[PDB]
Design a protein around this ligand. Structure first.
Ligand SMILES: CC(C)(C)c1ccc(N(C(=O)c2c[nH]cn2)[C@@H](C(=O)NC2CCCCC2)c2cccnc2)cc1
Ligand SMILES: CC(C)(C)c1ccc(N(C(=O)c2c[nH]cn2)[C@@H](C(=O)NC2CCCCC2)c2cccnc2)cc1
Lengths: 298, 290
């Protein structure tokens, strides 16, 4: 079992370079619109309290240099939507894939194509944490890299990257420009709140371990939903809901292990640790595979 | 720190479906040749001891069905090189990238594009282990999926997937049909040999840790190459060579921790969100991404 990303080709044919002033970062070129973080128009003295409406009104089309490979794209118009800037260009992208824009919830996973200067650098799998941050691998200039899923050759864009937080994690927006969580595109004192382990995902991963070869962690016990939550919250696990129990139903039915029986196994794993053993290759309980990801990989 | 694969677009464009009789798997379409495991001409009845030159002599061009997307490719010739089948087609691939066929060394990493029915399904990062297996994620029908590295628009293909071993690990060939490891494309009882941990990659990953926040494992001490290799033998770690040390040079500079200083640390032994010593990042992997 691997954390597997989606093949990135459909997104690669969309990545461009956007330069405004002395600042360069990445854009996403779909049809005749280039999307990028609006903070590309921030100046070095703007960074603490920029007024983006005032910064924008002072720009004309030619202040924005867009490059797709070696080809320069002529920007013919521009507007702002929440925290993303939309640059209208004279050419529709011939490589535009079937796509849609989605806003995802905590626990959801997606692939990230890390890019620099509009050129793709690497692809990895990621997840939206309950504190609305991303535990990414981003260097300076990665802004405008996007996160996505691919389902039936339609690309679901769910994340555009904006900034790094003090603890090394990352904040960004959906493709309508609205931030995940309470962060702002502003040099400021903001920090990610406390984060929880994603209980529904850990349970999905235990079922995946059963689907493959391992039953060593099961036990003969069961538990009520409330007792499970009272224990698991003592380890900073996210409370399990009735929705999460319904969601695990198909894996439960597939393996023959009731959801609350699997909850009993998890309670014990938290109590004992793994005692030198491994589950699917890991000595930690993994929480970035969803019930959907499990069914896909098997 | 994340396990990250190369962008896969240049390779996605080369994947086709190959059917011979009742069997289907994936092929690599470069210029006007499709590459795939020769065991696609095996049938269910003769899995135990195929005679491949015989099965191929009895074959004709029309025995092979090649589909690139929804376009059927007309096969105009067939040929075998070691354990890979080469199907000549009448159309060069307009999406062929700059490429080379390369053969990698144990401890080197590559990206894998897992496919089913010629269709790219996912991408992930792998390492060639010292027992010449791959700890991959491959379902039935993944045969024909390739591994690769990219070096400024040139795709170096290093792996084609053939089969799974009973421990759940995987065996394949380079693109010239030469197996990695003592494995045969036969329904036989073969197993992976004992697997050592890749010591130079573990050290590289510790340097990646120091480069980020994690510094707690460092110490004031140093070991000798020989005293460490004595501990390495105990714990089934690959012995460390002067070549491994020289290759970690750049990272030893960037941190001020000499290899034998880090080796003292590694002797004593969460470090990057892991409670295992990770050994599938090369020195080069660490320098990239960082
Ligand atoms: C203008 C604004 C909103 C303050 C800003 C400034 C710099 C960036 N960062 C760019 O690298 C960058 C910016 N523009 C082109 N590149 C980096 C970044 O977040 N440093 C933060 C440092 C503390 C205060 C807030 C910004 C970055 C590094 C690694 C991965 N992701 C992003 C992002 C946003
Ligand atoms: C003809 C030959 C060499 C015996 C063979 C037969 C089946 C396959 N396997 C195909 O899935 C497959 C084959 N052709 C189309 N699909 C599976 C496989 O490796 N081993 C079985 C056969 C060898 C002995 C025991 C297990 C497989 C591959 C990748 C991931 N999980 C399972 C590979 C090679």
């Amino acid at each position: 079992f691997r954390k597997m990303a989606f093949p990135s080709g459909k997104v690669e044919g969309c990545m461009v370079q956007v330069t405004c002033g002395t600042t360069t970062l990445n854009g996403l070129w779909l049809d005749d619109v280039v999307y990028c973080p609006r903070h590309v128009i921030c100046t070095s003295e703007d960074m603490l309290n920029p007024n983006y409406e005032d910064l924008l009104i002072r720009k004309s089309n030619h202040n924005f240099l867009v490059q797709a490979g070696n080809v320069q794209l002529r920007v013919i118009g521009h507007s702002m939507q929440n925290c993303v800037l939309k640059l209208k260009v004279d050419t529709a992208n011939p490589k535009t894939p079937k796509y849609k824009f989605v806003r995802i919830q905590p626990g959801q996973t997606f692939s990230v194509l890390a890019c620099y200067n509009g050129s793709p650098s690497g692809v990895y799998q990621c997840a939206m944490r309950h504190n609305f941050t991303i535990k990414g691998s981003f260097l300076n200039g990665s802004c405008g890299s996007v996160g996505f899923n691919i389902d039936y050759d339609c690309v679901s864009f769910c994340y555009m990257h904006h900034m790094e937080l003090p603890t090394g994690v990352h904040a960004g927006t959906d493709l309508e420009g609205n931030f995940y969580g309470p962060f702002v595109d502003r040099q400021t004192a903001q920090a990610a709140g406390t984060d929880t382990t994603i209980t529904v995902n850990v349970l999905a991963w235990l079922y995946a371990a059963v689907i493959n070869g391992d039953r060593w962690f099961l036990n003969r016990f069961t538990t009520t939903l409330n007792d499970f939550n009272l224990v698991a919250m003592k380890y900073n696990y996210e409370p399990l809901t009735q929705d999460h129990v319904d969601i695990l139903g198909p894996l439960s039915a597939q393996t023959g292990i009731a959801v609350l029986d699997m909850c009993a196994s998890l309670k014990e794993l938290l109590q004992n640790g793994m005692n030198g053993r491994t589950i699917l290759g890991s000595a930690l309980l993994e929480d970035e595979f969803t019930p959907f990801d499990v069914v896909r990989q098997c």
